[PDB]
Design a protein around this ligand. Structure first.
Ligand SMILES: CNC(=O)c1ccc(Nc2ncc(C(F)(F)F)c(NCc3nccnc3N(C)S(C)(=O)=O)n2)cc1
Ligand SMILES: [Cl-]
Ligand code: NA
Ligand code: NA
Length: 316
């Protein structure tokens, strides 16, 4: 019914995740053969949370970055909203940490610099993510990280900053959450945890945590600077980018600027679309340039994706 519109363009496979607000299926984009992830939201059962959908959608239309999960297609039917996103076949950072127990400081740094790159970019575009946690970071085919779930972005509790849980500073709050992430990467458990939500809340407010024996002095220092209860004493995003711990083995600050921004339309993509559809090239350019996030946008972007990984730009 609502799936009729979607099934014009995608073959649906297994459900790969269910959350509070959405389920996500693996799918194949018929015209390109590309696997994608389709986020499915029922407008009726969301009700008051329907603003989360528009928030994520508007954010993702304004974010284009090597460590951010790309949006391809938005389809609205009578009862559903479908968001077609980049499929990350490596799954969740969280499950990767559990499988390894914890990461070495070297590997943590490799991973963490990608998280800082994504989040600093998000902030550079005027947003705070506000729901940073390892469930929301996925591995793509290259084993590079992609940030997801922009439903709470502005322009869980275990990861929420004291000031944010107190109802007041979105920038500083993301830094706190990245500190909790950093802790989990290196330790393999949360710095603040409890079965009772108010007791968890108290632990967060107190800011005291276990410091395991395998952590280097420099890592301990970085955690201390990120996990300051007072956001005014917390390390700013700026100084995180070139922090000495962060610079170890790299010697350059985190590269946060988008490496894949939308400058001019790509000729191979446009050409292939015009040839496959047997349409006037200029019309094809004009219709792509509406950037409607309809099936034409989807096809164009999934062709660019083929190019991004050195494959030829070809439609079935
Ligand atoms: C098959 N077993 C796996 O464990 C697994 C899981 C995910 C993926 N890949 C993947 N790629 C892209 C998405 C995208 F774009 F939709 F976010 C996505 N989402 C599922 C999703 N993921 C983690 C947290 N919430 C999730 N959903 C409820 S949510 C907030 O609506 O995205 N999952 C691959 C494998
Ligand atoms: Cl980097
Ligand atoms: Na423990
Ligand atoms: Na940069």
């Amino acid at each position: 019914k609502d799936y009729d519109e979607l099934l014009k363009y995608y073959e649906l496979h297994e459900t790969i995740g269910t959350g509070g607000f959405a389920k996500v299926k693996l799918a194949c984009h018929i015209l390109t053969g590309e696997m994608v992830a389709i986020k499915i939201m029922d407008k009726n059962t969301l009700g008051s949370d329907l603003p989360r959908i528009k928030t994520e959608i508007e954010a993702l239309k304004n974010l284009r970055h090597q460590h951010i999960c790309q949006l391809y297609h938005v389809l609205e039917t009578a009862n559903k909203i479908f968001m077609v996103l980049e499929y990350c076949p490596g799954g969740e950072l969280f499950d990767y940490i559990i499988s390894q127990d914890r990461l070495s400081e070297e590997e943590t740094r490799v991973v963490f610099r990608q998280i800082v790159s994504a989040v600093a970019y998000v902030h550079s575009q005027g947003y705070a993510h506000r729901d940073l946690k390892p469930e929301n970071l996925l591995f793509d085919e290259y084993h590079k990280l992609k940030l997801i779930d922009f439903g709470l972005c502005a322009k869980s509790l275990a990861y929420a900053a004291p000031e944010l849980i107190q109802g007041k500073l979105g920038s500083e709050a993301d830094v706190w959450s990245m500190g909790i992430l950093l802790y989990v990467l290196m330790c393999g458990f949360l710095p603040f945890d409890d079965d009772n939500v108010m007791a968890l809340y108290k632990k967060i407010m107190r800011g005291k945590y276990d410091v395991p024996k395998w952590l280097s002095p420099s890592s301990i220092l970085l955690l201390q600077q990120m996990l300051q209860v007072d956001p005014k004493k917390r390390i700013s995003m700026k100084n995180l980018l070139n922090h000495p711990w962060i610079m170890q083995d790299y010697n350059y600050p985190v590269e946060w600027q988008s490496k894949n921004p939308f400058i001019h339309l790509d000729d191979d993509c446009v050409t292939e679309l015009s040839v496959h559809h047997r349409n006037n090239r200029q019309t094809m350019e004009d219709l792509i340039s509406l950037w409607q996030y309809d099936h034409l946008t989807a096809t164009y972007l999934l062709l660019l994706a083929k190019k991004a990984r050195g494959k030829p730009v070809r439609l079935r």
